[PDB]
Design a protein around this ligand. Structure first.
Ligand SMILES: [Zn+2]
Ligand SMILES: [Zn+2]
Ligand SMILES: [Zn+2]
Ligand SMILES: [Zn+2]
Ligand SMILES: [Zn+2]
Ligand SMILES: [Zn+2]
Ligand SMILES: [Zn+2]
Length: 435
C-alpha cells in the first residue's frame, strides 16, 4: 500500500511541457505502477522503500486522475491539472493574504477560477534539510478559499491565467519577518548542513528543500525588509545572488526564471546622513538583474510611508506578471521602466543615459522631475533639477558647480520620486557613485 508526498495530492497543478516526476514510498523492493492520462510507468522501489518514475512531458489540461498501484491497493489523486507552477516565497508582503489587500473583499468575491490553485506550505523549520513537508494541501481559487491565498501571488497568477490560458498553481512558501539567511541552504552560507525565521538555513530546510524535486516554471520573491540594515543591506546583493544560483542548481536549471519585488517606500527610521540602508538594499536588488533570467518589479510609488505592509498588492502582481511574461514566457512587451545605464559629468551638469526599455520617459503628475540629488567631490548631496531628453536626463544644481555623482530616489521613503514611463511603471532608484 504505497504513499505519496503531500504535493502529489488531490487538486494538484503539475508543471506542463517537461518530464513529470512521481515519487513516494512503499515496502522495500515493492512493485509500483503509476498512470496518468493514459500513460503507464512501472518501477521497483529500493530496499529503503523509496520509488520514483518520470512520466512523459504533458501539455496543459485537466482534470486528470493520477493512479498509483501496489500489490496492497491503489492510490487515486483526483482533479489534477497540468499547467505552470510558480514558487512564491519571501516574508510579510508575499505572505500577505488576499482578504487583507486593498481590494480584498471584492477580489475574493470575484475569485471564481477552478484552474488557479494554491498550495500553502506551513510555517516550519528544521536543523537539517528535509525530504518531506509537514503539511499543506491544494485549494482552488473559489471565494471560500481565495481569502487565504497570497495576495501578490493570486494577482500574479490571475494575470498569467489571462496571458497563458493554462492552469496556474502557486506554491506559497512564506514567513513574515524572515531573513534571507533562513531561506538559504548551508552551502550558499559557507556553513555545514531566538526567532527561527532569522536563523541560517532553518526555513530552507523544511519549506524549500522538500519542494525541489517538484518542477516549477519559475519563482516569485518578495523579501528583504529584514536585511535592510546597516550591516546587511550591501552584502545582500551577494547573498541573494548566491541563493538564486543555489536554488537553480538544486533544480538542475541554471536559467530558471527568478523574479522579485524591490522594496516599497517606507519610513523605516534607518536613514542617517547620506547613509540609507533601505536604498542600499534596493540597489542590492537591482544589481541582481545581472544574473540570467531575472526580473524586478519596482513599487516605490505604491508603498505606505507609515506601514511596512502596503495593501495595494494588485499592482505588485501586475508588475511581476509583466516581468514573468518577458523572462519566463519569452514575450516582448514593456515589462520595465527605463533603467539607468551610463553617466557623464562635464560642465556643471550630469547627463544620465537610460535604456528606455521600449517606452518613453515621463513624469507622474506631469510637472517637474522630482527625486534627484547631486554631489561634488565633498560627497555632500544637494537637491537637483532634472530635464528629460529622449533617453537622457540632464541633472544639475545651483549649489554644485563640479558634480561627480547623482542619486535618484536614494532614501527609505522616496515617495516624491516621479520618473515613470508611458505605462506608468516607475523608474528604479539608483546612484552613480559607489561611496
Ligand atoms: Zn512530502
Ligand atoms: Zn538535498
Ligand atoms: Zn503593517
Ligand atoms: Zn494587470
Ligand atoms: Zn530579456
Ligand atoms: Zn542614447
Ligand atoms: Zn513627500
Amino acid at each position: 500500500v504505497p504513499t505519496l508526498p503531500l504535493l502529489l495530492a488531490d487538486g494538484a497543478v503539475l508543471q506542463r511541457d517537461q518530464p513529470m516526476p512521481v515519487w513516494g514510498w512503499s515496502s522495500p523492493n515493492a512493485a509500483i505502477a503509476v498512470s496518468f492520462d493514459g500513460k503507464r510507468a512501472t518501477v521497483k522501489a529500493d530496499a529503503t522503500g523509496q520509488w520514483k518514475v518520470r512520466l512523459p512531458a504533458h501539455a496543459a489540461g485537466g482534470p486528470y486522475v493520477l493512479r498509483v498501484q501496489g500489490d496492497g491497493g491503489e492510490l487515486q489523486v483526483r482533479d489534477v491539472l497540468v499547467g505552470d507552477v510558480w514558487l512564491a516565497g519571501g516574508q510579510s508582503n508575499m505572505e500577505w493574504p488576499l482578504a487583507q489587500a486593498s481590494d480584498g473583499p471584492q477580489a475574493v468575491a470575484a475569485a471564481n477560477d477552478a484552474q488557479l490553485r494554491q498550495f500553502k506550505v506551513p510555517k516550519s523549520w528544521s536543523v537539517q534539510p528535509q525530504a518531506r513537508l509537514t503539511g499543506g494541501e491544494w485549494k482552488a481559487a473559489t471565494p471560500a478559499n481565495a481569502g487565504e491565498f497570497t495576495a501578490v501571488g493570486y494577482f500574479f497568477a490571475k494575470e498569467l491565467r489571462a496571458s497563458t490560458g493554462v492552469p496556474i498553481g502557486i506554491v506559497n512558501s512564506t514567513w513574515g519577518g524572515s531573513a534571507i539567511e533562513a531561506w538559504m541552504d548551508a552551502a550558499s552560507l559557507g556553513l555545514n548542513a531566538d526567532n527561527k525565521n532569522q536563523l541560517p538555513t532553518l526555513l530552507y530546510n523544511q519549506m524549500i528543500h522538500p519542494l525541489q524535486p517538484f518542477p516549477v516554471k519559475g519563482v516569485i520573491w518578495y523579501q528583504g525588509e529584514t536585511n535592510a540594515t546597516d550591516t546587511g543591506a550591501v552584502k545582500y546583493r551577494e547573498q541573494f545572488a548566491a541563493m538564486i544560483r543555489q536554488w537553480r542548481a538544486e533544480r538542475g536549471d541554471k536559467t530558471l526564471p527568478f523574479l522579485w519585488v524591490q522594496l516599497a517606500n517606507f519610513k523605516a527610521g534607518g536613514d542617517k546622513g547620506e547613509l540609507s540602508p533601505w536604498a542600499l538594499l534596493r540597489e542590492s536588488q537591482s544589481k541582481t538583474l545581472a544574473l540570467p533570467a531575472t526580473g524586478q518589479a519596482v513599487i516605490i510609488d505604491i508603498g505606505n510611508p507609515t506601514d511596512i505592509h502596503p495593501t495595494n498588492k494588485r499592482d505588485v502582481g501586475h508588475r511581476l506578471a509583466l516581468a514573468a511574461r518577458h523572462v519566463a514566457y519569452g514575450e516582448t512587451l514593456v515589462y520595465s521602466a527605463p533603467v539607468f545605464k551610463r553617466a557623464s559629468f562635464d560642465g556643471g551638469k550630469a547627463v544620465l543615459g537610460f535604456d528606455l526599455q521600449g517606452s518613453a520617459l515621463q513624469v507622474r503628475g506631469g510637472g517637474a522631475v522630482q527625486g534627484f540629488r547631486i554631489a561634488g567631490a565633498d560627497q555632500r548631496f544637494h537637491p537637483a533639477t532634472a530635464q528629460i531628453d529622449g533617453d537622457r536626463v540632464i541633472v544639475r544644481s545651483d549649489a554644485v558647480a563640479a558634480p561627480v555623482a547623482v542619486r535618484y530616489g536614494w532614501s527609505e521613503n522616496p515617495d516624491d520620486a516621479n520618473l515613470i514611463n508611458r505605462d506608468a511603471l516607475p523608474v528604479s532608484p539608483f546612484r552613480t557613485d559607489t561611496w
